[PDB]
Design a protein around this nucleic acid. Structure first.
Lengths: 464, 107
DNA sequence: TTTTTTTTT
């Protein structure tokens, strides 16, 4: 196979087979002939009809991926012969990125990066979409050579073509969200530090020049900024956010309005690779409760077994709370519930800092919860994992309860009042919606702690 | 064809399954590696014994299509195998529901 | 050379 890595066990890939067929059609007209003669031949052939047009575009595309010494010539021919502004090519790129990226041969990956950059420079329609789909293949919690290569490669395109990036509000927010998150992972070697600095400068310039566009991210932007707050460039940014927000934008009152704005789902989703999503969605829709062990083991083995992978866990947790909102039929079935997934992910934490970050991600929509603007499905997992862990693993219930109390003055002290109000609104609304009918039997349960059972029977009087 | 339909002596078995477990490798007296993999359908589970290199490629979670399989009893255990002219081909991973029970390979 | 109604105790 020319596009994909395959073992002898792997079935033949239908998409790879189709692209190879197309390349061989183009090749039948371009080999052994001059470049002018070749273009005359392709022009003629394309005119015969729309499927021939597809064959030729997909052919040239595949040659660009598989023949780097013919790539510049073939992109030139592609641009010339394409009748749909390279749209068929863009769909196929997105298809390759969403479905085949992990199997894509090194040469083909290198070439694809080259192609996208060439697409940006040409001002092709939809290129910004392609860049976002590309960014989604950069996995969080992964500092392998190939993943780091992709992070830097895409960043280089974005920075070199920053003027073009500024035309796309969504691409600005997405690039900032993506790189603010990856920065956390980029330390430990000289190579990682050098890349982090480039990512810092890039995010900082977009935040300062286009703050308002970055705000469409919503409150999770704050979580990401806190996680990089000790980096000098970001300390400066914070004092501007906290003390004179107006420099950032006249339309930016302060951090509160940002905390009171929900996070858009596309941002939470972009920090899971296609394979991560496919697996979690399958777990939360098709896996029967009681049958989840091997699925969990398989997921854990692939994504959560390295020390570097720890940061990936908050992304999964925000994704479960904010993106996976199961139908009524799933909720009323024996399907693996979101709270069980959450409980599983919490036990895979291998340090107290990871645990704390995980808990913050779980409760993140509790902090400033307004019942008319926020979805109750975002706050449901936390309360349900607390409730259902009472008997079996009372350790989990206890610690989350402790965190729920202590996060109020600690999350962001000048807004303790608001956070307190948020946690209260969350709790109230959880009762009003019958997610949990009674809050009392969670605070007096005999299987709890001496100190905590007391700490509970205090912090909220309304639950005795 | 489903796992539950597999019977001693049947051949030309074509089916799909997801692997749950890969066992330890043993060596035949003439130098072949053999390993037993537990695989499953929504109708239950069965062992497949896989000779040689493909045996090292198979991973738990793999969704595999078997063509021209045959079945036979080895050490009291109904077992599935790849026939002459047949093969194992991975067509996906993870996303398949299955039942562990019955285990058609129990003695 | 594609093993294969295969597998030393």
């Amino acid at each position: 196979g020319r596009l994909l890595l395959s073992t002898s066990l792997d079935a033949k890939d239908e998409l790879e087979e189709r692209l190879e067929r197309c390349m061989s059609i183009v090749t039948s007209m371009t080999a052994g002939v001059s470049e002018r003669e070749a273009n005359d031949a392709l022009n003629a052939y394309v005119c015969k009809g729309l499927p021939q047009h597809e064959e030729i575009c997909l052919g040239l595309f595949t040659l660009i991926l598989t023949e780097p010494a013919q790539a510049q010539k073939c992109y030139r021919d592609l641009a010339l012969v394409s009748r749909d502004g390279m749209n068929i090519v863009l769909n196929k790129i997105n298809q390759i990125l969403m479905e085949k990226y992990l199997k894509l041969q090194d040469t083909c990956r290198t070439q694809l990066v080259w192609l996208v950059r060439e697409l940006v420079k040409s001002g092709v329609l939809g290129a910004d979409g392609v860049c976002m789909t590309f960014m989604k293949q950069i996995a969080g919690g992964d500092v392998t050579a190939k993943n780091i290569w992709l992070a830097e490669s895409v960043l280089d395109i974005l920075t070199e073509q920053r003027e073009w990036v500024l035309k796309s509000s969504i691409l600005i927010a997405m690039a900032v969200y993506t790189y603010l998150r990856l920065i956390v992972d980029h330390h430990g070697t000289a190579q990682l530090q050098a890349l982090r600095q480039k990512e810092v400068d890039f995010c900082i310039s977009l935040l300062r020049e286009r703050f308002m566009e970055c705000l469409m991210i919503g409150r999770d932007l704050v979580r990401l900024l806190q996680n990089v707050a000790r980096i000098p460039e970001f300390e400066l940014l914070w004092k501007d956010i906290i003390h004179n927000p107006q420099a950032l934008s006249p339309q930016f009152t302060g951090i509160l309005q940002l905390l009171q704005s929900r996070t858009s789902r596309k941002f939470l989703a972009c920090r899971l690779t296609p394979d991560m999503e496919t697996k979690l969605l399958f777990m939360t829709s098709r896996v029967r409760f009681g049958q989840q062990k091997r699925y969990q083991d398989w997921f854990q083995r692939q994504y959560l077994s390295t020390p570097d992978s720890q940061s990936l866990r908050c992304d999964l947790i925000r994704y479960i709370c904010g993106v996976v909102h199961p139908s009524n039929e799933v909720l009323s079935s024996d399907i693996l519930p979101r709270w069980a997934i959450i409980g599983w992910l919490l036990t895979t934490c291998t340090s107290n800092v990871a645990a704390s970050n995980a808990k913050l991600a779980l409760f993140y929509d509790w902090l400033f919860f307004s019942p008319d603007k926020d979805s109750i499905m975002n706050i449901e997992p936390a309360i349900l994992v607390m409730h259902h862990s009472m008997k079996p693993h009372p350790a989990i219930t206890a610690t989350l309860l402790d965190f729920m109390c202590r996060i109020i003055p600690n999350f962001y002290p000048p807004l303790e009042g608001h956070v307190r109000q948020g946690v209260f609104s969350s709790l109230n609304h959880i009762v009003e919606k019958r997610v949990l009918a009674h809050l009392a039997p969670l605070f007096d349960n005999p299987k709890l702690d001496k100190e905590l059972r007391a700490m509970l029977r205090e912090k909220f009087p309304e639950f005795c | 064809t489903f796992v539950k339909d597999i019977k001693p002596g049947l051949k030309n078995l074509n089916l799909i399954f997801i692997v749950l477990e890969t066992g330890r490798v043993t060596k035949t007296k003439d130098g072949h590696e053999v390993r037993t993999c537990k695989v499953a359908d929504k109708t239950g589970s069965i062992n497949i014994s896989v000779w040689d290199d493909v045996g090292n490629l198979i991973q738990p979670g793999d969704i595999i299509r078997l063509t021209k399989g045959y079945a036979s009893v080895f050490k009291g255990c109904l077992t599935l195998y790849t026939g002459r002219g047949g093969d194992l081909q991975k067509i996906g991973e993870f996303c398949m529901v299955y039942s562990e029970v019955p285990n058609f390979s129990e003695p």
